[PDB]
Paper text:
Further analyses also revealed the presence of non-catalytic CBMs within the C-terminal region of BgaA that mediate adherence to host cell surface LacNAc and/or lactose.
However, fold prediction using the Phyre2 server, which does not rely on amino acid sequence similarity, distinguished two regions (XII and XV) with a high probability of adopting the β-sandwich fold common to many CBMs found in CAZymes. The two predicted CBMs were recombinantly produced and the polypeptides screened for binding to all commonly occurring monosaccharides by UV difference spectroscopy; only D-galactose gave a signature UV difference spectrum consistent with sugar binding. Subsequently, this approach was expanded to the relevant galactose-containing sugars LacNAc, lactose, galactopyranosyl-β-1,3-N-acetyl-D-glucosamine (lacto-N-biose), and galactopyranosyl-β-1,3-N-acetyl-D-galactosamine [Thomsen-Freidenreich (TF) epitope] and binding was only observed to LacNAc and lactose. Significantly, the CBMs only bound with significant affinity to sugars that are substrates for the catalytic domain. The shallow LacNAc binding site sits at the apex of the β-fold opposite the N- and C-termini. Tryptophan 1514 lies directly beneath the glycoside bond and coplanar with the disaccharide thus providing CH-π interactions with both pyranose rings and a higher affinity for β-linked disaccharides than for galactose alone. This binding site architecture accommodates lactose and LacNAc, but would limit the recognition of other sugars terminating in β-linked galactose.
Author numbering: 1466 to 1643
Amino acid sequence: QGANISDQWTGSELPLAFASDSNPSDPVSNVNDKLISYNNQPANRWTNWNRSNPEASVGVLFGDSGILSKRSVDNLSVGFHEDHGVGAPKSYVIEYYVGKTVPTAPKNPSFVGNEDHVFNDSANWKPVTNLKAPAQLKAGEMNHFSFDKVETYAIRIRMVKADNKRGTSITEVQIFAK
Ligand SMILES: [Ca+2]
C-alpha cells in the first residue's frame, strides 16, 4: 500500500476535500482529517443531513508539496457512518475529473454547488471504469473501491441518500498512491 494522497497536511492547502453541499456543522474537511469516528464521541463526519438535495458528492482535489497536482488513482476507501438520521447512500457513482480547465480550490469547499466552479459542470467528469466495490455498502467500516487507473486532479463519489435517512454520512475517505 502506497502513500496516502488524500489526507490533509498541516499548513498545506492541498489535498483538499470538497463537497457539492454539506450540513454546515459537518464540513467536508472532516473526511480527510485522519480522525475516524463512527459515533458522537467525538462526532467527526461530513454529512448532508437535512439538506435540500438528496444527492451530494464528496471528493478530493490532489496536491503535491502544497500545490495542485494530478495523481494516478486506482482506489478509494470510504468510511460510512450511520445514526437515526444518516447512513450509507442507496446509490452512488465514482467519477474523475477530465476538464481541460485546471481546477482551482473552491472558495467554500463544503458547498461547491453554491459557487461558480468547474466541478459543477458534469462535462468535466467521467465515471471510473471496471469498478470493484462491495456488494453492499456498510456503515461502521472503511468500504474499499478499486477501478482502472486514471491520471486526474480529483475524484469524487456522488451519492443519493437512503430513503429512510435524512442524509448520507462519511467519517473519512482514504486514497493511496501505487
Ligand atoms: Ca475524519
